[PDB]
Amino acid sequence: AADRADILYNIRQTSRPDVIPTQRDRPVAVSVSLKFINILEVNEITNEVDVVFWQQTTWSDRTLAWDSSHSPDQVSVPISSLWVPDLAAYNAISKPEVLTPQLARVVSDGEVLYMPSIRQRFSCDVSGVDTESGATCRIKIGSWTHHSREISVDPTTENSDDSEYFSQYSRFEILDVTQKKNSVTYSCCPEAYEDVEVSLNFRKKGR
Amino acid sequence: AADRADILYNIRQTSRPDVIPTQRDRPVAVSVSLKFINILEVNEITNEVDVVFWQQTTWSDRTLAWDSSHSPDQVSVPISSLWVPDLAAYNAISKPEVLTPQLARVVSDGEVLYMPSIRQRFSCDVSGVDTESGATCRIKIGSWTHHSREISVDPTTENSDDSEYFSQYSRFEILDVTQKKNSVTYSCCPEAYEDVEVSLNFRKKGRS
Amino acid sequence: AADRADILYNIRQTSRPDVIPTQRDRPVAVSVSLKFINILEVNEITNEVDVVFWQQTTWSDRTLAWDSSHSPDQVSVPISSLWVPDLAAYNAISKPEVLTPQLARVVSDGEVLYMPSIRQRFSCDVSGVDTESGATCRIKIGSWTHHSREISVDPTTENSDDSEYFSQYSRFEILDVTQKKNSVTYSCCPEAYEDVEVSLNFRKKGRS
Amino acid sequence: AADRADILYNIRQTSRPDVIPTQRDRPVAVSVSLKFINILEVNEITNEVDVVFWQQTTWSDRTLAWDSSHSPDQVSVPISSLWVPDLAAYNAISKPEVLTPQLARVVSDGEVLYMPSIRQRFSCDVSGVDTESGATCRIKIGSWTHHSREISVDPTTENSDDSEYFSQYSRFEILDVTQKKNSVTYSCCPEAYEDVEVSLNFRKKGRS
Amino acid sequence: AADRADILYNIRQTSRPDVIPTQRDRPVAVSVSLKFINILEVNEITNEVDVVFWQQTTWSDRTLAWDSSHSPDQVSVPISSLWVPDLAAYNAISKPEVLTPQLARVVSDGEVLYMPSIRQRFSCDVSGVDTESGATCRIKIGSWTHHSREISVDPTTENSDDSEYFSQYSRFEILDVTQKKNSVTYSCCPEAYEDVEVSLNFRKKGRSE
Ligand SMILES: O=[N+]([O-])/N=C1\NCCN1Cc1ccc(Cl)nc1
Ligand SMILES: O=[N+]([O-])/N=C1\NCCN1Cc1ccc(Cl)nc1
Numbered sequence A: 001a002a003d004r005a006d007i008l009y010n011i012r013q014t015s016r017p018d019v020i021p022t023q024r025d026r027p028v029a030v031s032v033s034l035k036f037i038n039i040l041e042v043n044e045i046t047n048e049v050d051v052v053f054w055q056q057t058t059w060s061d062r063t064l065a066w067d068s069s070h071s072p073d074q075v076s077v078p079i080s081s082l083w084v085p086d087l088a089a090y091n092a093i094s095k096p097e098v099l100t101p102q103l104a105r106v107v108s109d110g111e112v113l114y115m116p117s118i119r120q121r122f123s124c125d126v127s128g129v130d131t132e133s134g135a136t137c138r139i140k141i142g143s144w145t146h147h148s149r150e151i152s153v154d155p156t157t158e159n160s161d162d163s164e165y166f167s168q169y170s171r172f173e174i175l176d177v178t179q180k181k182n183s184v185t186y187s188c189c190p191e192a193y194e195d196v197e198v199s200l201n202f203r204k205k206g207r
Numbered sequence B, C, D: 001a002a003d004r005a006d007i008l009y010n011i012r013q014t015s016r017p018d019v020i021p022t023q024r025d026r027p028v029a030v031s032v033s034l035k036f037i038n039i040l041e042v043n044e045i046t047n048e049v050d051v052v053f054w055q056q057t058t059w060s061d062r063t064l065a066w067d068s069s070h071s072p073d074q075v076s077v078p079i080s081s082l083w084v085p086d087l088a089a090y091n092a093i094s095k096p097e098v099l100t101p102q103l104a105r106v107v108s109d110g111e112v113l114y115m116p117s118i119r120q121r122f123s124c125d126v127s128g129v130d131t132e133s134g135a136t137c138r139i140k141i142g143s144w145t146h147h148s149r150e151i152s153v154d155p156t157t158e159n160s161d162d163s164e165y166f167s168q169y170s171r172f173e174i175l176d177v178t179q180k181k182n183s184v185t186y187s188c189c190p191e192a193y194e195d196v197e198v199s200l201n202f203r204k205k206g207r208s
Numbered sequence E: 001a002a003d004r005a006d007i008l009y010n011i012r013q014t015s016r017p018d019v020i021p022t023q024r025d026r027p028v029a030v031s032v033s034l035k036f037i038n039i040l041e042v043n044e045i046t047n048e049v050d051v052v053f054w055q056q057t058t059w060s061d062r063t064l065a066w067d068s069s070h071s072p073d074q075v076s077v078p079i080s081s082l083w084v085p086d087l088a089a090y091n092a093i094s095k096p097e098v099l100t101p102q103l104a105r106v107v108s109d110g111e112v113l114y115m116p117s118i119r120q121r122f123s124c125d126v127s128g129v130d131t132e133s134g135a136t137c138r139i140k141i142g143s144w145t146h147h148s149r150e151i152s153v154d155p156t157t158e159n160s161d162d163s164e165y166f167s168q169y170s171r172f173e174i175l176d177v178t179q180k181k182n183s184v185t186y187s188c189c190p191e192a193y194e195d196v197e198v199s200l201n202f203r204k205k206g207r208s209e
């Protein structure tokens, strides 16, 4: 028998927040998916947008696993007691603002899920935002210090209303949201850094 | 039998701020209620409001209980010493700005109460704010990671004037406030998250 | 003869920043007095105002007293090492911006003083600020979690220059200040919470 | 011999950040000098200024001294590991914004230097900023909780250009800066607090 | 056996984040380079600019070195677990805002690399921003408390592209960027402080004639 006080106590005795949980030599698989909740500010001249989205993140950590046959197989743990992917938005022009409790969910099998709601300003193409076709703002999010051999980032291609949780009170509306995978190399070093290109096709409303 | 100093020592020895106090296997019953204090900024064009309010939060944590027959049955404790529910306004567009000292009240029977004054910005229906019927802006508050099996949220029952604490110097006024309970499920997972929907009907003040 | 180091060390070893220094079962008599130093942002439309003031607070904790016949009878101690009254401005719409070092003064007889300079925004009656009688903004401050039986606030009694330290460069001027005591209760609970109501009667200085 | 690691380690073990290094009974001698870097915002209507300046502070703490014959005679230390004068700008309307690494310099003789670049807003005379005479904003800096007997402040006795490190891109320019020594006293208590009055005579650079 | 955990563990036991890694007794060589990403607000009247850039910093700390013949030769460590140059922009009017996770890259040969994306506001010459030649904003970055005998800062002047990483959606375009090493002394004290003068020449896009 075991409770939540133990599941956490154990996570503390095993988790290494500062050490990436690289199973064997295989890189840590990190899935990234953004759920656009709102579009607060847009500047058709400076090409900047202020958005609110849930940055759904999922990865795995073996050392945190535990037998949940007689205890819960999931618990909410502060991200501070857990290693977290140093994901970053390459084209963000403001520090990320986390609007929610910074708590992740850990499953008895090492599965970890973190989904904070974030408000952030980005630098992207805002042209055509006031037309029927709308504009497309691409946001590149991927690890900042871990390359392909250490961390890998893949989106979540599937069926889902790109504006399922989008505020109906926004002055904008979402037309389409596609998230593809890609890599980023630099004119210095050979190693590339996997990322996810989230393409946001939105437009201003007009009755 | 003891003093406030002792009471505090035991709490810090038994309390587990990072572990939900799920008595048995049932969810923790958290009550939420919002006492609107002020309505500062409104924008019918962007549908954003800036509101000040007290977030009456109450729940139970039996592990904190102590003998109060001959000792104080109530003490003030830093929330950082107690487990606190991970509530979040769903339509909030700014993190909550706590205006008051982050102190909770704990009773001998383990009942906990925390009522901080908060100033937050929400995204909601502001249309009609300058009309006689006013606008109805709805705010949804509930746990962020704990579903219905772990935390249950319900509004506090207490029929009183909605603008009983509402500043008479605000540019707007409260026509009515109704706090209902609801559940939000996400297309992926069968877990439902309980929340409270506080609908604030307010308008701009006029004259004649 | 004890030095300032031995004095602090003794304070640190006996003071409990999270435990109210209650003697017996009598409330801790806290003194609150505001010294308005400046008045900046003002809006008669939104009924808000930016104000800078010294929140001269004082109370006692006899457990910290020491013999100063041949030693310093006062030291500057970091408020984080001491228990400080959890006071808040009920009608404030921004958290207090403490401009000065967060240091208190502990006196050999257990007396404690804390006088931080603060800039904060308030929602009060700003109407008439541009008239001869000016405007009258009232600020309510008091304990946020401790009720009358645990804490009691009483404004310092002494006729002082209401603008003794007020900035001459401010676009405004103070007509008069009245610090009256007051009590507040809620339609939920019996216990009351004492507070101080400071009435700042100020007006905009006329160039003619 | 002893490398930097040893010196820095020794300081961290003997530093008493909350106790004033008062040699004997004579107060701690603190020297302050403001080296203006820029004038960003100025409002003659509200008498406010936003400026950037290097607040050079100098004092001694013999306890930190060491033998630097065959070792480093100066090391950089975080001001958090050391005691620091609780200086305040009596007429500031915003808390100081330290823009530079909060590191100090500790010389082997126990001399401590702390020169942080700060941006802060003040409430002073701006009238004339647009004339050939220019405006004369006066800034009072001094200890906030230590009086003459515990802490003394004196401007660095020197004669250097008042615009040496002033930005050439600023819309304004400095006519002259005088750093006079002064003191303050409050109607209640006999103690006096030593300060420094920095008078900044500046004006807007005309279109020529 | 030595995985990432150990590499980090030992780094925490032999690393003093507040003690500058002065090998022998010579000064620490810090290489500073800026990679401009975007130019936001620009006020020609007040002469101020909001810029975004990656501050590529590189130096060596031997107390961190380790054998990498049969183990990882690189890891990511929080900058708080190690020593970092106290660089500062002398003409900054706002504290640096770090947008990206604050982690450094540590190689087994003691080599340390820190490249944070920073958003900072500066006071410089903005005149001519809306002209063909454009404006030239100079940003001075160097150590704040370590003089030339303790820290030497030299830019990594390598034949690269200046607007290589600059956002294409910015209202401005980079005409040229030059990073010249320099020193700053004061009419009070003998010590000289090394720095890097980064001159950014830019102008508004889409002008006429
Ligand atoms: O499954 N979901 O879509 N969940 C979800 N969307 C918004 C909030 N939320 C609950 C949740 C679930 C797990 C974690 Cl780590 N955080 C939050
Ligand atoms: O409405 N109330 O019941 N109480 C209340 N409103 C403002 C201050 N206050 C007292 C109080 C009591 C307990 C706690 Cl944890 N916080 C606040």
Ligand SMILES: O=[N+]([O-])/N=C1\NCCN1Cc1ccc(Cl)nc1
Residues within 6 Å of the ligand: C054, C103, C104, C105, C113, C114, C115, C116, D144, D145, D186, D188, D189
């Ligand atoms: O009015 N006073 O008596 N004192 C006073 N006003 C502003 C600063 N000051 C000195 C002081 C005295 C005591 C404490 Cl705890 N802090 C500061």
Ligand SMILES: O=[N+]([O-])/N=C1\NCCN1Cc1ccc(Cl)nc1
Residues within 6 Å of the ligand: D054, D103, D104, D105, D113, D114, D115, D116, E144, E145, E186, E188, E189
């Ligand atoms: O003497 N100075 O003017 N020094 C100086 N001006 C700008 C930077 N700098 C170096 C310095 C040296 C020592 C300390 Cl504690 N702080 C800063």
Ligand SMILES: O=[N+]([O-])/N=C1\NCCN1Cc1ccc(Cl)nc1
Residues within 6 Å of the ligand: A144, A145, A186, A188, A189, E054, E103, E104, E105, E113, E114, E115, E116
């Ligand atoms: O330009 N680069 O060489 N590298 C680079 N640009 C953006 C991210 N990145 C990789 C990186 C590598 C090492 C560190 Cl400490 N930070 C970042």
